Each structure stands twice: as structure tokens, then as C-alpha cells.
Amino acid sequence: PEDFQQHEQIRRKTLKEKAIPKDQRATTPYMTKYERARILGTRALQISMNAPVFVDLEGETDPLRIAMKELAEKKIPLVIRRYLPDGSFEDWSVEELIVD
Amino acid sequence: DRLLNSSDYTQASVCRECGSILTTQQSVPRIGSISTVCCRRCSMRFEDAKIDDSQIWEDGQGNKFVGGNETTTVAIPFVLKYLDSELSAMGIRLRYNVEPK
Amino acid sequence: CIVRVPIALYVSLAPMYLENPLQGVMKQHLNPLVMKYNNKVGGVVLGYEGLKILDADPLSKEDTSEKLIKITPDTPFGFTWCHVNLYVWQPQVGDVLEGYIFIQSASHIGLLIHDAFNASIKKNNIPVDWTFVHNDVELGHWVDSNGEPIDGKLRFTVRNVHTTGRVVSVDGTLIS
Amino acid sequence: MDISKPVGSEITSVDFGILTAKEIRNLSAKQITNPTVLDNLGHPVSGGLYDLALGAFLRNLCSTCGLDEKFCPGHQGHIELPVPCYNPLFFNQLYIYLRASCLFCHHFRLKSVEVHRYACKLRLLQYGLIDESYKLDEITSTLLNELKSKRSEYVDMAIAKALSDGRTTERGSFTATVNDERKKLVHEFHKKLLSRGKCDNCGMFSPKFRKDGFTKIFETALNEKQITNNRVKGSTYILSTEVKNILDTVFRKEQCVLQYVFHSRPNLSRKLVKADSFFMDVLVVPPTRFRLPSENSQNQLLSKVLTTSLLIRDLNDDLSKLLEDRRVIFSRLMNAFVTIQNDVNAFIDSTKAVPIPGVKQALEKKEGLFRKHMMGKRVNYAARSVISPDPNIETNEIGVPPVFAVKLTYPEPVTAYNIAELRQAVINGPDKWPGATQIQNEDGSLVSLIGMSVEQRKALANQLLTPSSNVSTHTLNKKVYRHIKNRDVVLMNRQPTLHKASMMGHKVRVLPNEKTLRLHYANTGAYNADFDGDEMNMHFPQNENARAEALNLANTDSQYLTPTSGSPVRGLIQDHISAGVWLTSKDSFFTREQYQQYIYGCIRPEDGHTTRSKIVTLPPTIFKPYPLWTGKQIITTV
Amino acid sequence: GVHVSYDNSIRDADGTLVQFMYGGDAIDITKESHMTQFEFCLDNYYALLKKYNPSALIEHLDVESALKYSKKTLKYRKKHSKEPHYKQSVKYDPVLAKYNPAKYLGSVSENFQDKLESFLDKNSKGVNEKKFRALMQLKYMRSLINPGEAVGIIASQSVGEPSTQMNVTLGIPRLRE
Amino acid sequence: TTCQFLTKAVLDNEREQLDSPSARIVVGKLNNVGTGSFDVLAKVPNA
Amino acid sequence: TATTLNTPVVIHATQLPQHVSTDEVLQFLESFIDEKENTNLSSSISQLKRIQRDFKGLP
Amino acid sequence: MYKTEKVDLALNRNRGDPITQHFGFGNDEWPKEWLEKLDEDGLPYIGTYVEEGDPICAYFDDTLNKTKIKTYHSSEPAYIEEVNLIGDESNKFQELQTVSIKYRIRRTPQIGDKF
Ligand SMILES: [Zn+2]
Ligand SMILES: [Zn+2]
Ligand SMILES: [Zn+2]
Secondary structure (H helix, E strand, O other), X not given: OOHHXXXXXXXXXXXXXXXXXXXXXXXXXXXXXXXXXXXXXXXXHHHOOOOOOOOOOOOOOOHHHHHHHHOOOOOOOEEEEXXXXXXXXXXXXXXXXXXX | OOOOOOOOEEEEEEEOOOOOOOOOEEOOOOOOOOOOEEOOOOOEEOOOXXXXXXXXXXXXXXXXXXXXXXXXXXXXXXXXXXXXXXXXXXXXXXXXXXOOO | OEEEEEEEEXXXXXXXXXXXXXXXXHHHHHOOXXXXXXXXXXXXXXXXXXXXXXXXXXXXOOOOOOEEEEEOOOOOOEEEEEEEEEEEEOOOOOOEEOOEEOOOOOOOOOEEEOOOEEEOOOOOOOOOOOEEEOOOOOOOEXXXXXXXXXXXXXXXXXXXEEOOOOOOXXXXXXXX | OOXXXXXXXXXXXXXXXXOOXXXXXXXXOOOOOXXXXXXXXXXXXXXXXXXXXXXXXXXXXXXXOOOOOOOOOXXXXXXEEEEEEEOOOOHHHHHHHHOOEOOOOOOXXXXXXXXXXXXXXXXXXXOOOOOHHHHHXXXXXXXXXXXXXXXXXXXXXXHHHHHHOOOOOOOOOOOHHHHHHHHHHHHHHHHXXXXXXXXXXXXXXXXXXXXXXXXXXXXXXXXXXXXXXXXXXXXXXXXXXXXXXXXXHHHHHOHHHHHHHOOOOOOOOOOOOOOOOOEEEEEEEOOHHHHOXXXXXXXXXXXXXXXXXXXXXXXHHHHXXXXXXXXXXXXXXHHHHHHHHHHHHHHHOOXXXXXXXXXXXXXXXXXXXXHHHOOOOOOOOEEEEEEEEOOOOOOOEEEEOHHHHOOOEEEEEOOOOOOOHHHHHHHHOOOOOOOEEEEEOOOOOOXXXXXXXXXXXXXXXXXXXXXXXXXXXXXXXXXEEEEOOOOOEEXXXXXXXXXXXXXXXXXXXXXXXXXXXXXXXXXXXXXXXXXXXXXXXXXXXXXXXXXXXXXXXXEOOOOOEOOOOOOEOOOOOOHHHHHHHXXXXXXXXXXXXXXXHHHHHHHOHHHOOOOOOOOOOOOOOEOOOOOEEEOHHHHHHO | OOEOOOOOOOEOOOOOEOOOOHHHOOEOHHHOOOOOOHHHHHOOHHHHHHHHOHHHOOOOOEOOHHHHHHHHHHHHHHHOOOOOOOOOOOOOOOOOOOXXXXXXXXXXXXXXXXXXXXXXXXXXXXXXXXXXXXXXXHHHHHOEOOOOOEHHHHHHXXXXXXXXXXXXXXXXXXXXO | XXXXXXXXXXXXXXXXXXXXXXXXXXXXXXXXXXXXXXEEEEEEOOO | OOOOOOOOOOEOOOOOOEEOOHHHHHHXXXXXXXXXXXXXXXXXXXXXHHHHOOOOOOO | XXXXXXXXXXXXXXXXXXXXXXXXXXXXXXXXXXXXXXXXXXXXXXXXXXXXXXXXXXXXXXXXXXXXXEEOOOOOOEEEEEEEEEOOOOOOOOOOOEEEEEEEOOOOOOOOOOO
């Protein structure tokens, strides 16, 4: 009530301090080979657990082949939180990142 | 997957103020009650606590006492729970603090 | 004595509610919580108002529709913090409650509070001068200090609250 | 791990500490006292090591939580020791602080103004102030009360300057290079602390101590040359209660120094450090789950502790009853002080007391616990067989036999797109490929398909995709443990896995007849795998996170160039190299039939190899007298 | 725990820093075999332009700025190097330790900047002299090592595994010392 | 020499942030190199 | 029951509670009932309408 | 391949204590499923085909009144070739407690075999 009120506003002040804004981010604009496989992996766990699919299924029954099809038309609704070694982070969505 | 998900994965229960894996345990309920998960280290005896009827639980001994309900289940390997048992015999306490408190 | 608590809750979120995330917090963690007893709230949770997901990135406005949910590394379920205003009916000791008669026995007085919640008044709480008449037909009544059968309201004071079973129970005495 | 059973809380940090005696009395389930383990009729004795309060044991419920053997987590108990004994993990450092301390004022013998200096240099090193501890040495009976002000004022000044200039949190900064200067300074502290003649506060000597090894302690004879300072001031096995009766008083006078010696991170908990932390008045027995019989060696080491613990209790009965008897009962009680010490030595450390393996030796070396059961583990959903060479497999695949394709299985949660190919798979059953061996229901249930006929098994194919009967499971779905298809992924792995390309991710392609794993020739340059009876491990990952990595990240087509030099390590080896010298000769000419048979025999458009949906060809090299295609022109149109 | 960070700056798992850039240039060993094969790539200009597609990457990257500083140091270094390396007030960082090479086009290593401009000086051959240097500077940038690479394992698997094939000491006792 | 480093840890009262891959297999975290070097965050449409 | 799919992980209290009168309760129970009507809680709507009638009129 | 194992019913006793375990069948309700393998003397038939799970001897126990068996603990199916009666030398002529059984296994040359 008063202790958790102070515990929460500290925890959200650091996580804003660790946030790097969108026009002040200076990492790579490419989706790496490590970011690409986890985007395909985490989305395919969602498609297998009845998430709404943003692409026409052409008889694709493998959830990892559907997520490779959502990545082509840039429909995967995920965001990469690229951590810096300070503990700070940068938020890149999959639609902003380019492949290969 | 190889070193944790397909060998000795377990969702063991952890106290949030002890940070100890091998303390908390299922309470022995009354008739019609539910068996909650509850802590042994940071609890207090009912003879020692001079209460609101919901923080009070009981062993299978017949020892009923009121204490730590701050607990949660954390996915660990099981071999960590044996590491705590080999270290607490030596007298080494491992405080596994969890992030949502 | 319905009171308002604002809370904060760390919940899960399944991928079927990735298009409607406020729906998924209601149907998983809130709609199984109405008309039950919750320990960290204080009493019986009636309902809720004002569910707002705390966004992950703090650089977003409160006006923003899109919010970020931190997916578990192992499982596709997402986790989030939420604020919601629960309304909770809490009984405490020394308080006076309006009752409705449901059980007239020679052991307890099983009555209902606000047409939903059970309560009881034990035998040793009933004093000496309030005697009971038997019913060989079908359930009698306790003759009071002035000689009339009880009906309608029965204003008693709370002795103890028993939430341990399925529903809440309120123990109570009949003195001042 | 089930992907539909998440976990909310995660461990963020760990920190190492010592069980005090108040905790493990409140922590404990039931203290146990007699050194017998199980009596007759097969049931264990109550009050002993196998106890029903410490856990379920051999079809008998737990006396604490009331659960059977499959669900009781085990519970710790404690045994009482009548004397506070040494902890053999800390006798190497207790004897450092047992020495270096005067036995009169109970400070250290080193001067209190310089003991104040290390307590100010080690406070700055708790924070990220590795620089300012050297500037502290530049700060240089009445003036020592002001020198200890100027040193302590600079420490408080430099902390609040750095903590406000965004540099060091109140949790302290602790990198590698401040762990260097800290360990160097504490070694500097412990070195000149021991080398002291007299206490610099009360100027007289103190009798020196002798370390017999472990299990004992001795003080030495104070010399007649320097007893005279002990009169102008105005050998013996000492007890373990006599050692604690000094180090209590030592660690109270000098709390401000050992508060920073025994803490790397700044002590936000404000716990006082104590000398009881170096002894262990109360052992902790492990739960009965972790000492089941093979009896077990930890029950044998705890037996001799409890066997001595009743002798020394009965030896103390005569001390309540009482001069010839007083002389013999106390030279035999003191013989029991060393033995109950020597037991808890041998309980923890088998080398500091042929022998029974102790608690330390279950942890130390290879064939231990960190290297044998934490960094390396036995795994499920895995396999091992001899490999045999195989062409006609598409170089990113493995050839799995039917004896492997039936056992190994994968959890497919049912959806709208699964229920055509996963209803047919659950009809086939456990002994038909592609089949299914189980169905995991919504509520975490598990229905084995082995003992079911074809009529019951087709009935569960329609119960497979149903709306959930419960609100608490309204968002889950059933998971069919299907067999491994030809679209799955596999980690092949040959020992010794000396580089990362010796553990690659292959696609699968089953074979219907032969009982061995089959590997293409372009993979033998990476695994160092000739086919002379060599066998290699096959791992089958069980979720979509690990499937997306052994196809995209640890794929075998990704690993063409080794990272040692950048050179390729994949290619053809013996007969393909000799055939291409013959095929690309100038003598090789092929007619219209021999040309088109070699091209379709290697392309096969129906297996997804060409890019044109029609095999295009070239005009022949020679047109007349009859058309011929040279072997340079095979590999052109290939 | 030693890995490439997102600063292109390889460092330990606890945050302490090993090298400020991987090898001095942060290019991948498995992506550099044709990076200085310049005459191979001039024969395959119209084939490599299809696999990088430089027209679909201008909207996100800074083409021009790192090429301004690419000439402030190249013209500076040729004017110097008459003296040895204890005199050189270098006045400038290299173009790679100042601009991020994964983001800024033309921010390359100094050997690659010299070996390109030495190749492209000697011989003179529908691709001209300046359409080709704007493709090797983009082949370099895709050859950058990815942030997150387990470098310290790879660096230590590339020394132990070549030691399998093994008047001063020599061999595996020399690596032992 | 596990218990020589164990006693140097517990005498120093040493807290560790579980950063090394050796300490993320003892306690079962995700490894901070490669695929665990970042978080994945889902964009949900409604408030 | 008693799963992270059912209960929150950790449940807190942001602020101290203060008591409300019947006008706040009835305006809530004419909005919480309205936007839920317009499933196990379908039996719990009836137990809320047993409370809704006791603060307006008579049963 | 010819594999031989010795079934011995006397390696849990010493010093003249009576033979609690006799070869053959007793008189309880033992399941008649395994008349396909075992003869009336408890010993298996010569030439029968035995896979993992089949009994290779039947013996009656006196402290349990239960004709237990011993099963074939090998995952490679064999054929019982010879069954010996090792009789023990004593002046008081003892009932048998030792039987050696020999198997044979078809090692048809499979793939993976080394020539
Ligand atoms: Zn606790
Ligand atoms: Zn138990
Ligand atoms: Zn002194």
C-alpha cells in the first residue's frame, strides 16, 4: 500500500532509465542469425497454441513453416529487446529489421 | 533442451523471503480445505504467536502454526535441490531470490 | 461495508488472447475470482473495474493502443503487470451485520447475509433467557426476552470469520 | 518440460550464506537422536535417521506433509551436538582469527589505527572505488582520534561523491579488477595480522597456539623471558567451548572491521557477523529421499555422530552426580570431545579426518556432482547407433530406422491444421509409422495408446479436438505424442566433439527396412567419421524453440566453412572425386538417352530440387553424324 | 561467456571488456573468404548484386557520412608513413573505431580499404570503377560478425582441435607452457 | 577445487548475478550468449 | 485448479482501502452486471443480483 | 553364438540348513501359461525358442508356497540347446540345486557386421 507503492515506482524508474529512445539507438539495423531463429521459434510456439494467424495457410501444418511464411510478409507481431551490457536495452520490432 | 528440459526438469516450489528450495511443503488441510504450499523456515509457532484464520496451517504431526505464505513455483533442475542438501549439511545457505516479489 | 482496494497483479497471457489482451486477463485471472474469497485482498471479491495493462516499454504514452508483453523464454505464454480496482465485501470483528433467516435449529442459527453469504450463531453465544420451542410437525423458533418469535432481520455482532472451507462463514455472539 | 505449463518466477541472483543455529531449529521437521536406522519388522525406528517425519519411505506416508513416495519432496531434520564443534570448511580461517588476537583486551594485536585503515580501504572496495583506496593512504593518543576521523571522513566523502555522480549504486560495484584488489588487500590484512609480537593497545604478549592438523587445538607454553610484561601490566588441549569464549569477545570489539572483511557486496541487511558462524552447534541431516539405501554411507557417518552423542550425554550424568571419580570422568569426557569432533570432520571431509566418502567428496572431482551431473547430464529423447554410409540422401538429412522412428516421439498440440494429419497419426497407434504413442489431455492427463485396440483408438481420435470441459483449462489443447516424421530435426553428434561442427542439426528422412543410422558422404569431413563401426549420438529436440535452431542456426548447411581458418570442411570424398575425373574427361560423350537419364537421375523435380518445374537441357556438342553430349555439358545443365 | 556485444565490442559475460572490436575489424571468419577476392567478384557483379540488393537498403542506412571520414584518414595516412610508429601523431581514429560498420556504409578496415584501392588502381576494365567499390563496401558490411556470437568458445575450439593433429620446444608442450 | 572456492564464496558472502554460462546451468537459466542475448516482446493491439 | 493459468503469480495492494456508500456500489453493480451480461461466472451473476436487490429494494 | 548360464538354487544358504527351494512345480495356483516352455521337472525343453520374458526354470519356494520362476534376461532370442544336471558330491545324496542351461543364437550376417 505504501511499501509496494515505493517498490513499484522505483522499479519503473530504472526500467525507463534503461530504456533507449527510438531516434537515439545505434545498434545494427539487420536482424541477426540469432534473432531470426528465435522469432521463428517463439512465433511457432504461439501458432501451435492457437494464436491468430496473419497469413493464408496453404495447407501448412508445420508451425515453423507458417512462421517462416509470416516472416516473409513481415506480419510477425514481435519486438526484439536488444540488451546492452550496461543493462540498458533497445526495442526493435521485426518489421523495422531487414533480413540478409 | 538437452541439459534441462529433457533430463531433470521440475517446477519446484520456492519461498520468496527465504529463497530456499527445500523448505516449503504442502500443508495438511482440514476436512474440505485445500492443501496450500507454505514455508517452514520463516514461520512462527502458534504457541509463539500469542492471526486471521487463513494464514494458519498445520503439519501432519498435529502441529498447527501460522507463518510464511510468500511462496511460488520456479522451474529448476532437480540436481540443484540435491546441491542444497549437500551444502546445508555443511552449513551453507543458498538464498535463491526470485524476481516478482 | 463493501470497500474498494486498488491492486497490482502479475498474470499470464495465452496466445489465443494475443488479439484481445484485456479479454484474456478477465477470462483467466478475474472471472474465476469473482464471488470467491481471496487472502491478499481481505474478504470476498465482488467484482472489478478499470483493468489497465502496464506496458513494457516506458517510452510509450498512456494513450497508446499497442503494448508490449514479455514472452516467457520456455513457453509461448506472456507475462504482464496490471492495475485493477477490485470491490471486496470484508467482514471484521466488532461489526454489525444485517441478516436473513434460513435455519432455525436448537444448535445454531444459520442465516444469510445479503442473500448470498452464510453465517452462524452458536449455542453458547445464545444466552440463558432465550429458550427454544420444539416443532413436532416440521424447525421452531427461539423465544426472546419479551416473548415473540423472530422474523426478518437479526442484527448481531461478529465473533470470528471462517473462510477456510468453500465459502466464507461468520461466527457471532448475541450480547452487546 | 511442457510448453503449456509455464513458470512465473525466475531466480535472478544467488548468494552464499551460513545456516545459523536459530534457523535450523525453526527450519527442521523433527530432531532425531538414536544411532539406529531401522529395527525389525522392516519398519524404520521413529527418532532415527530413516524417519517418517523426514519424508515418505517405502510405501509409508510422510508424517509432516502426508504424501506418498512419488510426491513427498523430503524434509530436513537436525541433530543436537552437546558441544559447539569446529566446521572443517572454516578451520583454515578460524585458526587465523584464533591467532592474531590478544587474549586480554580481545582486540587483534595489530594496532587499532591501522586495523581501522583496512576497514576503510575495504569499504571503498565494496563500492566501485578502486582508485580512492590508494588516495586514502595519502591521508596521514589524541591525534589518532583525529587521524581516524580524517581517514573515515574521506571514505564517507568519496562514497557520496561517487554515488551522486552516477557511478556506483548502493548495492556496490563488483567487477573482476576490484576482486583483484580486494583479495590482495585481505591477504595483506591477514599476513601482518598474524605476525605480531604484542598487542599495541595493552602492551603485552599472549600464548601462541598450535594446529595439530584438524580435530584438535593446542596452546603453547608462555616463555619465562617475557612473562615480566604480564606482571607490570597492572601443551594443553583447550576446549572448543574455550575457543568460542574468546572469539565471541574478539568479534564484538572489532565488528567495524569484519563487517567489511566478510562482505564483498555492501551489507544492506546489517547482519552482525559472529563467531558462532565458524562453529556448528547443530548438524543438519539431509532428507530421507537423498539417502535411500543402495546401508548408505551418509547414514553410516551420521550414525557415529549419534553414537558418540549419547556417550557424551551419559558421561555428563556423572558430572551432575559429583574426587577420584571426578578425575577419571573428565579425562574420558575430554576424550569424547575429540571423537565427536572427528566424526563431524569425517562427515563433511573424508580427507581431513580406505575411508567412508564424506559430503565434500560427493562434489569435488570428475565423477562428482558439478561435472558429472550438472554440466553434463543423461538425456531423454535420444539415441545411439552405428552409422553406415549412404548416397541418395540430400546431404542435410539423416537416415533413421523404423526401430528409431517408433520409439522417439514429439508433442504436437492439436489445432485446426493438425487434425487431418494428426487424427490419422493417432489412428495408426504406437506400432505403426507415422503413428502416435500417447495423448496428453488438457488437464495434464496422459493416455497411453499401447494397450488399446483399433476401435478404442479411433474413438479417441474424435475426443482429440473438443472444446474444453473446464473454465480453468479453457485456453489449452491436447498434445498428441506423434512419431518422428520426415520433417523433424535431429542433432547428430560423434565423440570426441572437438569442434562445434561435430554436432550438427540434420533433417530427417526415414528408411523402411534397415536397422542402422545412415549419413551422407559430405558429412564425414566434419565429424571425423570413417564408417569402420563408429557410432554416434542422435538427439531429438522437443519444442519449437529448439527446432528453429537446429534448422537455422546449428544447421548442417550453415556449417560449410569452419571457423578455424575459414576453409570449407564439407565435400565429396573417394568415388565421387574419381568419377568426376572420368565424367569431365574429353572422352566422355553421351547420346540422347544417356544424357537425359543422368540428369533426371540426379535432379528429380518431384523432390523439390530444380527451380523451373521442367528440366531444361542444352543443345548437344556434336550434332551430326549423330548427336552427342560431352561430360562437361552434364555438369553445366546440372 | 565471451561474446560479441551489440556495440560490436566483444566482452565477458559479467560485462568486463576483452577487445573493443573482434580482431580489430569484427568480420566473420566464415564470411570473409571472398572478401578480398576482388577479381572473382568483378566477374560476378551482376550475380552478387541480386543477393545483396543495394537499392532495397538505402532507406535505412547512412551511405554518405562514413565515406567522408573514409577520405580524411586515407589521404592523411599516405601523406605520413615516411616516419616510424613512435612519431606518428595520428590525429584521427580509423574509420572503423568511430563509426559503427554494421550501420554506416564505407566504414571498413584499413587493410580492406587499401587492398580495394590497390586492386582498383592497377587494372582498368558494363560495371565501371565506382559501381564496384560501392559493392565491396556492402559485402564487407554483411560480412560483419553477428552480435551474440560465442567467440571465446570458437576461439578456443580453433586451438584445441588443431592440436589433435600434432633447438627449442615445439608442439603441444609449447602450447602447454 | 570446489570447496576451496565454496568457502571463499561464503566467507566473502558473495552474491552473483548468474551471468556466466556455468552459473546458468547450475540454476537452470537461459544462456546469455546467442539466442538468450535479447528478449522477445509481443505487440498486443488493445489497451 | 491453482495454476498460473488460473491465479496471478503475485497479488498485491497498491493503496489503502476506503469505504464506499450504497450509491457507489449500485452504480458499480449496474455497470459490472451490464457490461458482463451484454462460463462459470454465469452462476455468479445470479449471486451478484442477490446482492443487487438487497441494496435497492426488497426481495 | 553359444551362451551358457548356470541356474543355481543354493547360493543363499550354508551349514546344513534344509533346501527351501526345490525344482519343479508345487500345488498352488500357478499360471498354466508357461507349459509351452517348461517340463514337469521344472526344467525347459530342449530346442524351444525363448525371447525376453520367457521362463527358463520353475522352482517351488517353501517360505512363500509359491512356484516362482527365473526369466530369460537377454534381449536377443535364443534356443535352448542342452540342460545339464550338476549333481553335488555328498555322502547323504542331495536333491539337485544346480542346473546349467546352454543357448544358441542365430547370428545371420546383418548390416554393420565386420568382415
Ligand atoms: Zn520463508
Ligand atoms: Zn513430506
Ligand atoms: Zn591486547
